[PDB]
């Protein structure tokens, strides 16, 4: 319950935050909504010497459409995501996913950037961002760069971010109007990380699937983009034969942990069932 002591900083700009993180080093950690970092500081699994609170940086909060993308500031909260009718018009899957994350109090504080930068395979936004083909904008001492969400995760708490960098925004391509979407989550209770969850976006034309993309949550040490699974659905009527093939290809890439949510084999099977249900709801919406 009691964290180790640390020094606290309140940079006024991204530039200042980055300089501070670069100077301070590995012992400094950015502090966003604090709803993953403080809990692990309280168990002392994390014992940073410095916390760099991003609270005062206004440029990190916001939702806008730019070209063919929606750009979301890293400090935008889950509550803000749910409240955005503009976002619900363009990317309705985000509100649906966000409503399945944690609880009201945690959603008032937790940010999309923190959810994506955490590296906990339990987080729901990572695989959703992979499904959507989102890009993460990073700013470090060496400048700005972009890393695809699909290439950002390597393991538990292991990501592509480099020392001194801050994830400043998430750029999400806007799916065709009328597209189908769904985030289907299986959990033990409100607030629990998924036993297995699937994110699906797809488009239809003349009764056949034109495009399909699938993300799988918490069924490996990282989120997973089920590339083969989505590919097999394209060109099909999204009937049982097609779904069976997609389920096989998705299950094939899972490697779940065996924990309180059940053994690996159960979670692999559930990734498949959540995928079927998500495709079904997405199909109906398309």
């Amino acid at each position: 319950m009691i964290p180790g002591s640390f020094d606290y900083h309140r940079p006024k700009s991204i530039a200042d935050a980055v300089a501070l993180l670069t100077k301070l080093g590995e012992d400094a950690r950015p502090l966003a909504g604090g709803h993953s970092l403080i809990p692990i500081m309280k168990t002392r699994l994390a014992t940073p010497e410095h916390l760099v609170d991003l609270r005062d940086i206004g440029d990190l909060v916001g939702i806008r459409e730019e070209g063919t993308d929606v750009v979301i500031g890293a400090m935008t909260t889950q509550h803000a995501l749910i409240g955005s009718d503009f976002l619900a018009a363009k990317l309705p899957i985000i509100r649906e996913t966000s409503l399945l994350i944690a609880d009201p109090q945690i959603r008032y504080m937790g940010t999309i950037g923190g959810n994506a930068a955490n590296g906990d395979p339990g987080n729901d936004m990572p695989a959703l961002m992979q499904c959507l083909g989102a890009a993460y904008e990073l700013t470090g001492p060496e400048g700005a760069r972009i890393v695809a969400a699909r290439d950002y995760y390597q393991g538990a708490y292991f990501t592509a971010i480099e020392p001194g960098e801050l994830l400043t925004a998430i750029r999400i391509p806007v799916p065709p109007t009328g597209h189908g979407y769904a985030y289907e989550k299986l959990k033990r209770k409100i607030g629990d990380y998924a036993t297995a969850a699937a994110a699906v976006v797809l488009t239809m034309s003349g009764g056949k699937c034109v495009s399909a993309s699938i993300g799988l949550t918490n069924v490996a040490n990282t989120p997973l983009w089920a590339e083969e699974a989505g590919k097999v659905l394209v060109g099909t009527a999204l009937d049982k034969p097609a779904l069976d093939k997609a389920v096989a290809l998705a299950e094939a890439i899972t490697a779940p942990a065996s924990d309180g949510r059940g053994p690996a084999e159960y979670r692999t099977k559930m990734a498949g069932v959540m995928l079927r249900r998500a495709v079904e709801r997405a199909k109906a919406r398309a």
Binding site: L186, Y266, K269
Partner: protein, 795 residues
């Protein structure tokens, strides 16, 4: 009339005024001059010898005032403390640790932040020993010797002493007659039902503030105690301090649910630390320590058997229990009942004979057993018989509702002497079972279920429907002095009532509420007895200097014991008021009759004296033959327990492909005799059914092969939120306890006792048409998925 609010009324709670405004007074709200904070360095190992403990870095940290180890306690003979089960538990590990998170050293610092820092600085060197976590192997020849302090390597069961890991063997019933019935019965139904380890998990953890006043030589101890007087007496016996100089105070407690009956190392260490330092010492545990080191509940492996005729008449019950008590036997229980009242396991049925045997064993786990609305192992007893009724019914190809009806103890048979020794006080089971069945449309549900099963067989649905039934007989109100005592103190309870000159009242009892509404309900009992408005009565519990001695609140004993004492004490006051009325009215007491709030002269109703006038007269014009004042005390030793009962029905739908179960309807009929406050009873039922739902569907505390305690935090421990908790439908019948002063039986634990078997029977019933056999709890999604997986439902 509007102001009385006596028995039967849905009186709103007086406790709510302060609680809704943050003005309750719980242990951690206490702040005293010079108060320090203490907490434990705990064991990372389940079983190991302690080679060395270096506390030098911790003691050197600024803000640290002391670091206690077993080395410090021995000289006071305090490194071990006695338990309610008659065993001892280590306060601070001496030569070895026996369970993960066991207390090793107690750090005392200026505040809880510095204490946490210091705990990290203590270094413990461990020498690993083989871990024992499977109770079924605890008594094998080569099983690890855990309790080196009291046992000697005894690898058998035919020596001068049991087995080094055997705690006790307790049996009751007619063994020869039971065995003979099973040897000839047409049908024998046997299953091994495991009631898995869970935990009471009150929202407020265990804690205390010890303050030894060295100038006065008096100890004041604030704490989360369900039995404050017992704690005072125990503290006196082990500390040498006399009881009149130990002031125990149980203030507002944020739920107990059995977790706060016993003493914990934290209480002893805070007291020793305060005595040593001369300043107050507060100890407050975090949730992970609460769930992994304080009283667990259940962990009974029950080989249960019923003998019957082909037509469904039950002839005998035979049950053997393997009880996992953890490393120390700290299982709360009256001293002569090592398995509590598990002998109430023949339940609501009239059986000729039965036999019960229980073996308790030690394992490398936290202690406990009796907690979480168990009524002293009645949760286990009811689960055993209600599950056995269902498996016998399946074997007989008979509807289980009809099997129960054919075997119910009938109304006319009460008081009924059951085959394992308990005499039930009153009960009308057929009427309650019929009301329940008619309310839920039982036979219609069975028809619906049959059609849904056929639809499943045709591939038309992936959902199965289960109907769970639990008809139970509880036994609460632990108190006959003949066989019920807590470490030698008879299990009575008490009430003291004092009426002031102007008519208001101060009344105290020997029990201790942790949310059950006593401060509201005891006043209702007095209000009806004396005709004094409930709001003119102040109720207090928990301060041992002021409340009459009692045995505390657990075993749903408050209404049976202190509730009875409250009525008897009020009646003593009523009797004295009648003498005062006779003196004032100049008539014989025989010429008076009580009428709601006054005594009237028979025949001359115009001549009367109200309780208020009599209270004033007792101070202003006391009759010469009587003492002034108007107050009384009663220590009530109950003649028998009270036996409330219930009929619970659950309709559950299960998705066989994910294992996800969803309660469709839950109906709970409870009969606890005279109902003091229907509103409060309803709240108790809602809470208890929610715990039952949690226990049956997901709650658990586990240990792996290495002794690691698993799931002991809210990250995994299933506490339902408002989203998962089913809506509850409640009903009742009223069958008064003939021996109780107001006919009221206890009821607090009934919902949990009857609810778990109800939920588990619904899950088991859903899969019965697929021949799943007995499915062990908890019934969470991955486990029900495995049931379906093993039945071939997923291919």
């Amino acid at each position: 009339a509007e102001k009385l609010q006596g028995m039967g009324c849905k009186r709103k709670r007086v406790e709510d005024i302060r609680f809704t405004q943050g003005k309750g007074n719980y242990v951690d709200d206490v702040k005293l001059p010079g108060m320090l904070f203490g907490d434990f360095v705990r064991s990372s190992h389940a079983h190991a010898r302690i080679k060395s403990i270096d506390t030098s870095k911790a003691k050197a940290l600024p803000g640290v005032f002391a670091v206690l180890t077993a080395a410090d306690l021995k000289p006071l003979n305090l490194h071990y403390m006695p338990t309610l089960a008659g065993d001892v538990q280590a306060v601070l590990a001496d030569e070895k640790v026996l369970f993960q998170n066991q207390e090793v050293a107690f750090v005392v610092a200026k505040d809880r932040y510095v204490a946490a820092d210091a705990i990290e600085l203590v270094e413990v060197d461990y020498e690993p020993l083989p871990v024992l976590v499977d109770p079924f192997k605890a008594m094998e020849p080569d099983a690890p010797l855990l309790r080196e302090d009291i046992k000697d390597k005894m690898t058998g069961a035919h020596g001068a002493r049991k087995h080094h890991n055997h705690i006790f063997r307790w049996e009751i019933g007619d063994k020869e007659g039971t065995d003979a019935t099973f040897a000839k019965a047409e049908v024998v139904s046997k299953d091994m039902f495991t009631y898995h380890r869970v935990h009471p998990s009150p929202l407020e953890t265990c804690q205390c503030v010890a303050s030894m006043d060295k100038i006065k030589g008096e100890l004041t101890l604030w704490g989360t105690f369900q039995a404050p007087h017992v704690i005072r007496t125990v503290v006196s016996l082990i500390s040498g301090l006399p009881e009149h100089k130990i002031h125990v105070i149980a203030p507002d407690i944020g739920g107990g649910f059995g977790n706060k009956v016993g003493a914990y190392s934290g209480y002893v260490c805070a007291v020793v630390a305060s005595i040593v330092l001369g300043v107050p010492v507060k100890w407050v545990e975090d949730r992970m320590e609460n769930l992994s080191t304080t009283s667990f509940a259940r962990d009974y492996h029950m080989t249960t058997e019923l003998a019957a005729t082909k037509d469904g008449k039950i002839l005998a019950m035979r049950c053997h229990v393997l009880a996992d008590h953890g490393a120390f036997d700290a299982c709360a229980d009256p001293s002569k009942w090592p398995a509590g009242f598990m002998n109430i396991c023949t339940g609501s049925y009239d059986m000729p004979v039965a036999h019960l045997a229980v073996d308790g064993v030690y394992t490398n786990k936290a202690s406990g057993g009796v907690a979480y609305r168990c009524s002293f192992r009645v949760t286990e007893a009811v689960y055993a018989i209600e599950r056995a009724i269902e498996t016998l019914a399946q074997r007989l190809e008979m509807d289980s509702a009809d099997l129960r009806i054919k075997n119910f103890i009938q109304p006319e048979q009460f008081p009924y002497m059951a085959p394992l020794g308990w005499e039930y006080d009153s009960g009308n089971y057929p009427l309650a079972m019929k009301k329940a069945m008619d309310t839920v449309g039982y036979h219609q549900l069975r028809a619906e279920q049959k059609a849904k099963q056929e639809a499943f067989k045709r591939g038309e649905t992936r959902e199965i429907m289960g109907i769970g039934i639990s008809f139970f007989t509880e036994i609460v109100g632990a108190g006959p002095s003949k066989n019920c005592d807590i470490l030698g103190v008879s299990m009575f309870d008490s009430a003291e009532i004092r009426i002031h000159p102007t008519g208001s009242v101060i009344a105290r009892m020997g029990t201790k509420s942790q949310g059950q509404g006593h401060e509201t309900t005891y006043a209702q009992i007095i209000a009806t007895e004396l005709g004094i408005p409930a709001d003119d009565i102040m109720i207090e519990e928990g301060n041992t200097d002021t409340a009459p001695y009692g045995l505390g609140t657990y075993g749903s004993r408050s209404t049976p014991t202190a509730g009875a004492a409250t009525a008897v004490a009020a009646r003593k006051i009523k009797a004295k008021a009648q003498m005062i009325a006779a003196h004032m009215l100049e008539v014989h007491e025989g010429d008076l009759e009580w009428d709601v709030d006054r005594f009237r002269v028979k025949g001359l109703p115009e001549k009367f004296k109200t309780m208020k006038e009599l209270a004033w007269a007792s101070y202003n014009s006391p009759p010469p033959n009587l003492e002034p004042g108007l107050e009384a005390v009663n220590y009530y030793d109950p003649p028998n327990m009270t036996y409330p009962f219930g009929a619970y029905f659950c309709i559950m739908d299960i998705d066989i492909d994910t294992g996800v179960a969803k309660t469709r309807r839950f109906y709970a009929l409870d009969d606890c005799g005279t109902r003091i406050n229907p509103m409060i009873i309803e709240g108790q039922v809602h809470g208890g059914l929610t715990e039952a739902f949690a226990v049956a569907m997901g709650q658990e505390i586990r240990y792996d092969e290495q002794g690691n305690v698993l799931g002991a935090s809210f990250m995994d421990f299933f506490l339902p939120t408002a989203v998962e908790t089913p809506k509850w439908e409640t009903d009742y019948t009223v069958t008064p306890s003939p021996h109780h002063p107001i006919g009221a039986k206890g009821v607090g634990e009934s919902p949990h006792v009857g609810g778990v078997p109800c939920f588990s029977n619904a899950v088991n019933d859903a899969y019965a048409f697929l021949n799943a056999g007995h499915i062990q709890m908890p019934h969470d999604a991955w486990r029900l998925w495995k049931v379906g997986e093993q039945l071939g439902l997923h291919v």
